[PDB]
Symmetry: C7
Subunit: 159 residues, 7 copies
Amino acid sequence: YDIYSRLLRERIVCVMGPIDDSVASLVIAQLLFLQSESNKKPIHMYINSPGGVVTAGLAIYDTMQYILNPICTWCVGQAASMGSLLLAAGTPGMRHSLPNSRIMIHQAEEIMKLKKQLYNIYAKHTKQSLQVIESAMERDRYMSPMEAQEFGILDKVLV
Amino acid sequence: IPIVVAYDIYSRLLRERIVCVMGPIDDSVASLVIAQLLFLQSESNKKPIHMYINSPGGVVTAGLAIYDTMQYILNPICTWCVGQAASMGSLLLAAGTPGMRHSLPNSRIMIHQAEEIMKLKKQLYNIYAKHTKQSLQVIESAMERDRYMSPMEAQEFGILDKVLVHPP
Amino acid sequence: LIPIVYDIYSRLLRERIVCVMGPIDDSVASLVIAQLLFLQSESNKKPIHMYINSPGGVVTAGLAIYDTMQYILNPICTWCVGQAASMGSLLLAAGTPGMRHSLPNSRIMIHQAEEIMKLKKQLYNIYAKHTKQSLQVIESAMERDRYMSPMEAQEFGILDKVLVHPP
Amino acid sequence: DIYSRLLRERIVCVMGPIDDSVASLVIAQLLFLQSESNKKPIHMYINSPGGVVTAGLAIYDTMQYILNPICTWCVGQAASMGSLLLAAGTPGMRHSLPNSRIMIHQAEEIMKLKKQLYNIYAKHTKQSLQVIESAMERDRYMSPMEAQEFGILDKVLVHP
Amino acid sequence: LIPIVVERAYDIYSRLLRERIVCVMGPIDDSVASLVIAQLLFLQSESNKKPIHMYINSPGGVVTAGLAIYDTMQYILNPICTWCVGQAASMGSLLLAAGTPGMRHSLPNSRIMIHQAEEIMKLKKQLYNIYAKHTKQSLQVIESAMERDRYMSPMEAQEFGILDKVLVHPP
Amino acid sequence: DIYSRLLRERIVCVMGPIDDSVASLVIAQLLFLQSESNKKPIHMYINSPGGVVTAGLAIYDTMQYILNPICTWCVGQAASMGSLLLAAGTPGMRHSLPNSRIMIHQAEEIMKLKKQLYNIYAKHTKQSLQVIESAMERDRYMSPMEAQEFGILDKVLVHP
Amino acid sequence: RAYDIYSRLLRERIVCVMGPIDDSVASLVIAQLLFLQSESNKKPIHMYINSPGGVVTAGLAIYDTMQYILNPICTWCVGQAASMGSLLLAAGTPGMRHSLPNSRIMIHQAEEIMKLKKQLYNIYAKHTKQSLQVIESAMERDRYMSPMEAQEFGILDKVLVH
């Protein structure tokens, strides 16, 4: 057992380092395998992502929403734009984050269309309207997890 | 890369009859996927295979190689789209057992891609028509247009069979 | 990389399925000939399947594979997958007459000091021995650089049968 | 692996520059060892020229999350985030061998980022904010004996 | 990568060593010389009389590495069975001729060539003498023929004395 | 593996540069061998052109904390930090082969670190600090016989 | 392939020193040498040399280990032995330094270079029985010596013409 494999036995899936197509392949593979291992038990996902490809991160967001396990997401260190989506996509009520975490939401025409999809999915999961998020995506700033608990991304900031 | 107990994670999923086609379609990916399928079809003549696509494109002859073997295998084939199925990916996506080319709601799909390339394009046209039922000039118009499509819109063109907003 | 427990190619090798995929170089020539001589060691009458997907290759490595294929008594079924270009077509042609197959969309193509023109006569000669067409016929085919469909490969004798679904 | 045989005896070797890759290994060993037991401590060997700021924080809050006592041994150089991790050891159990060197030194999020480091240093070293603010600004490696009066180490060890 | 056929599982090359087959394939190097020399020493320890088959496909290589292989080939008391496949050019031709007489072989379709710091001369003068010993040709025929740059058919090499049989089937 | 076969026999090979990477392994191997036996000798073989000072200092620190007698064998050259390791063998069992090549030669912070090097040589070579000053200034490798009179070695052996 | 047949060759006490002598090769060679002495203090060791020389301070580390050991060392030059590699060839036990019929041998390779040059001369002089004057003159010359020239020089004892 590699420690990553030992962790996977306890249904802990890491996402750390920039989300590329290869990390997505491993994360999707583990998730599908963890679903077939159990259609009931939770899965824990640890997010430390400085960034990610939009179509890669969208594939993981799809897979998480279209899987029947409860997904608990933990912010360790930083969840940049693509990671903040994946954090906010964990099952509502079970999105934890560590005290000194850093969250950032901010990121031709097809890119605007996909960016429009991101606006819509962020509005659903954080339960803000479209216009609130339209401004909050525009501001290129990190935020502390206490502000993110109020903004609606996190549920409980864990110390 | 994770291990599971000693199978690699992919080696475990291959037991669940799942073929991961990700990344560019190249000779190695085709060689590996063709070989995977030959094995899986030797384990059963009837059990549906699941092929999961996230691919930006690839070599035209490589995608045709997987397409050919997909036709020759007797098993049913679920073809799922996670992320994107561009260029040759859309042919592999279209090539599943008609009626069960499933997909995931936020995917993005793109059919768009001397005389060898021209004659070869007239082959892609015919095979898209057989799976998507469309007419040849319609395909040539759509293929000529370079813009992503949605899984709702993809199902209206016929490439996808069912978007799943969740497991049913 | 490769699905392992005893990767898939060792697993395919066990059923006498010998891949030649990617270009034919001396490195792959060394491996392919070794597999053949092993498979002849375990059983001599039984079939061997060779799957060819090659864009081309170094002429002297393919020739090494070619006369190795001739040397063994096994019937060698060749399967053309995506490409049999240049030497791949010659390796495809080397199968036991009747058993050189293609998938319905593969592209087959035979176009390629003093030794190179002498090497080409050998290529002329060896294509002719396997395709039964005349010598000037083969010199006319390879002078023009074009890919040709599997239906045409049947009439030229390179294939014997294109298989959409098994009989 | 001599490294994996040191994991059986509850030793985590944070050596080399701190990066997200080093962070993934380190936090994973820590979470595993807590699952093994909640009583026996974790021995942490720090030797790091430098570190990604958010990586070192990810170790620290993982450090402070676990119920284990964490024995922190500096060997060689514990610098920048390595000094946060060196301070991050449980109070009463921060060690060094006598030849080591230590350095605390290191867009509004950068300002808030540097600010949150001040608070954590103040919590564990118990020095006031102005003391730590000036000290981090001083680009100077400190000797362990200076670090010990500054409070970062409980014990400097000569021939234990 | 190499197909791992199971038996403990051997590489396909390790399987062929069991059958006493040494694959000298690719450009001859100091590393290939070490690999090939070690295999030959192990094979004599394996059997003091049973033959050793050497498959040669070498575009050439460093002469001082080729000679190191050839020297052990001469030293080893077992019969050696040198098969040309593909090509045996420059130093690979010397090993092709280094097998026991009447047992050096060539596939019907191989291409063979004997054409290749003043040691370059004294060593080249060495190569002529070893070619003279093994091909049974005189020194002058070798001197003039080695300067000709041209691959030779297996029939021409047969009549030169390098190889003893070109066949189509094992019989 | 051959190197781990030597570890079974209590041999630790500092072969090549003393870099952060190799210091981590040698420290780890040393801690292991202290646990295997609390009394049996530990043998060290040195062939080092040099390395980074802070990593060599981490090796020296551990060698001093390990209780056991450390036999330092010079095999090849011991340049810069390797000679400090060689001089840090427990007195009475610092050895070298006849044809070995030995070399002690090497901002404010480098000065401070280099002032540390002086004393650690001084207390092990039994030389006055001004003497270490002059003999650490000259860029010249010295024979094992010359090193014995300076104070680095104890025996220059030709056969055991 | 490379490193398990050599593990087999370690079994019958053959140490392959091939490729340029670098400290990694030198450190592995001495590690094998001490290990083989640890197996038996009296049995022979076979050394196979094909090296286009290498780094002098590590070749002296190899050379010093060879004079250290109790087991007799037999050096078999194959191919070419150059520079520092020729020092290993000379340093086998007198009476056990051999070569193939057509190997090639060469003895040619700050104050440290000058001092290193002097001590190499003593080693060659001790094991080859020449005068230091002969070694100076013979070490300047760049030429490779034939095996028969090397036997008469005294570097080697016997050539395996048989």
